[PDB]
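Supplementary Methods S3. Complex input for the magnesium ion-bound model.
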Amino acid sequence: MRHYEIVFLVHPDQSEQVGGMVERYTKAIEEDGGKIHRLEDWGRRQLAYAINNVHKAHYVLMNVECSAKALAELEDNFRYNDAVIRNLVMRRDEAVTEQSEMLKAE
Amino acid sequence: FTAEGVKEIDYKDLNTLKAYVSETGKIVPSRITGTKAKYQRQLATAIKRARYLALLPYTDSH
Amino acid sequence: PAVKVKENEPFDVALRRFKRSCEKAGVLAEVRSREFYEKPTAERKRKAAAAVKRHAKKVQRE
Amino acid sequence: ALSVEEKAQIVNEYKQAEGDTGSPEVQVALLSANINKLQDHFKANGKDHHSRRGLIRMVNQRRKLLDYLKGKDVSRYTALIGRLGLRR
Amino acid sequence: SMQDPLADMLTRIRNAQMAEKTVVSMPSSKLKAAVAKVLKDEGYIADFQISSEVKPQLSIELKYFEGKPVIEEVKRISRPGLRQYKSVEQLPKVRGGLGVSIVSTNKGVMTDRAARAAGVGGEVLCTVF
RNA sequence: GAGUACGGUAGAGGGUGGUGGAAUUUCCUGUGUAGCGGUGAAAUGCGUAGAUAUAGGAAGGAACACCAGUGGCGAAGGCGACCACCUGGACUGAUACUGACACUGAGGUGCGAAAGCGUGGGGAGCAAACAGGAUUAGAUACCCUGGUAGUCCACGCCGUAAACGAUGUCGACUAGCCGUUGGGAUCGAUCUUAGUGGCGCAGCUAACGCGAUAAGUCGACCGCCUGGGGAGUACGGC
Ligand SMILES: [Mg+2]
Ligand SMILES: [Mg+2]
Ligand SMILES: [Mg+2]
Ligand SMILES: [Mg+2]
Ligand SMILES: [Mg+2]
Ligand SMILES: [Mg+2]
Ligand SMILES: [Mg+2]
Ligand SMILES: [Mg+2]
Ligand SMILES: [Mg+2]
Ligand SMILES: [Mg+2]
Ligand SMILES: [Mg+2]
Ligand SMILES: [Mg+2]
Ligand SMILES: [Mg+2]
Ligand SMILES: [Mg+2]
Ligand SMILES: [Mg+2]
Ligand SMILES: [Mg+2]
Ligand SMILES: [Mg+2]
Ligand SMILES: [Mg+2]
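Predicted complex, serialized as structure tokens:
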């Protein structure tokens, strides 16, 4: 109904609650009435430039099919979270499942 | 672009995105690579999105 | 705008490499373009003149 | 402004010969519904003139269609104007 | 917005003889057919054909004689903005009678000479020389 | 002819919020010293009260390089950071549907660059007025150092521009060649559409030139002109 590909990256110092943080978020999509069709993780990556005097962050992408209220609450949680550091969404009209790339190399 | 690999390209295959960025982080004009107008148009915004995510740099100096 | 030194070549090849890199970057053009404000009318006039010159060159190529 | 489902509902409840959409009544109903659904959008966005141009275009088109229908058949005009319930 | 189709017939014929073509195709009508018939009767065109199937099309074959078109000048007199009507004695004589002027009388669409012979005036439609 | 229903594309079309990096300026702190800035040449100005360069930090405002194109969108004016939400129109494919429901349009109704006006905010760069230094016979200018309104936002007003293609809107016909934007169909080629450019045959034009995006051949309706000044001025109305 309203798909959203959201890529969220988080502070490296707190790159251990991210394993549980998604369950603090995915928790919503079911009682809203939506389904996640993809979730990946390639966190602890190198930054291109300094974002509040850091150079590394833990990345995570996921797809969501939720209502407006779920979007509002998740973005408000991002806004008032101390880690947050970055957020962005790519609302699309389809579904994608097959990861993003992982590493095609050995 | 047209034969097999991705009719529409997202900002995902950085192996393709980095092929279209100059050594100083600028975007290569279409007349140099010889690509098409539609693909250049979507490729520019793909690079901008990837660049905001701090995957790619604004400037090579920074 | 930046080049490394390595493997003790004479200090002229690296100089020409730096010159070539700087002129690929087009730094001089951009820094000249910021010396004074160009009102938009002059900008469109210059672009139109460049376009007509380019098309005349391409037509005269045959 | 309208989507597929409610457009189908309107053409269903305003059809004339089981499979027509060009009849005047369907067009007037669709235009009136779209105008009504756009009024609340224009309530909040006062400085959007470019869309208000299209709104006025729909208003004029509906007026033309109503004039033609009143020219053709009076009774159908009265029935339609009563069902949509608008001044003229 | 196609306010007048007979002027469109005349203009199509004129522009086609300027371009050195042989056949002209257009939508047909019971007035265009009469005009084409009188033109053929006067010898200004070779033939005219009308198709079937609710959208009939008039196809006119043009003459050339020498290296110049046979129809030298053609012009519509009574446009939908004037509606000129003439009597018997006021019927125009184009080029001293060498050409013809089409008149729609109560007896049908015909030429000025026929109207003078029958003693009937009418609605002047176009002039050809 | 005109319009409706159904899929799919492209777009700086409009509105409301949020978020980015670079760069300028100002303030604070560190080593370090005597010059910086500017010009045709200078000077005003800033300077050991530690500048510029340089390192670290802080606040604040505005514009969105590279893509970028005879490129796109919009009735015109005009519209380039990214993201979400609300929304208008155009283009494209087949079928069904309505069955002339159309064109133009005196009055009227709106939208309408920039400058300007009112109330309340904000204020980094720039910069009418203005101050000083030059140049000059003079220089109420061009040049240099500063600098206020304004340029920015909300609401309201103002109705103007070389508001230009100096070319009113709508419809139909008339050789061709080379590009290009975004869609289809056939077997890279061909065919066909809606735009957007460069040449060019007839034809037109006083000439320049226009030439399927006519200024050619024709229709429908509207606006306007009648020697140069006085003058788009006076008087009256709004
Ligand atoms: Mg300093
Ligand atoms: Mg009109
Ligand atoms: Mg008027
Ligand atoms: Mg008006
Ligand atoms: Mg203004
Ligand atoms: Mg003001
Ligand atoms: Mg004020
Ligand atoms: Mg000055
Ligand atoms: Mg004042
Ligand atoms: Mg005027
Ligand atoms: Mg303009
Ligand atoms: Mg004028
Ligand atoms: Mg035309
Ligand atoms: Mg030409
Ligand atoms: Mg003329
Ligand atoms: Mg006079
Ligand atoms: Mg006056
Ligand atoms: Mg007056």
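The two ends of chain C are 39 Å apart (CA to CA). Chain C has three helices and no strands.
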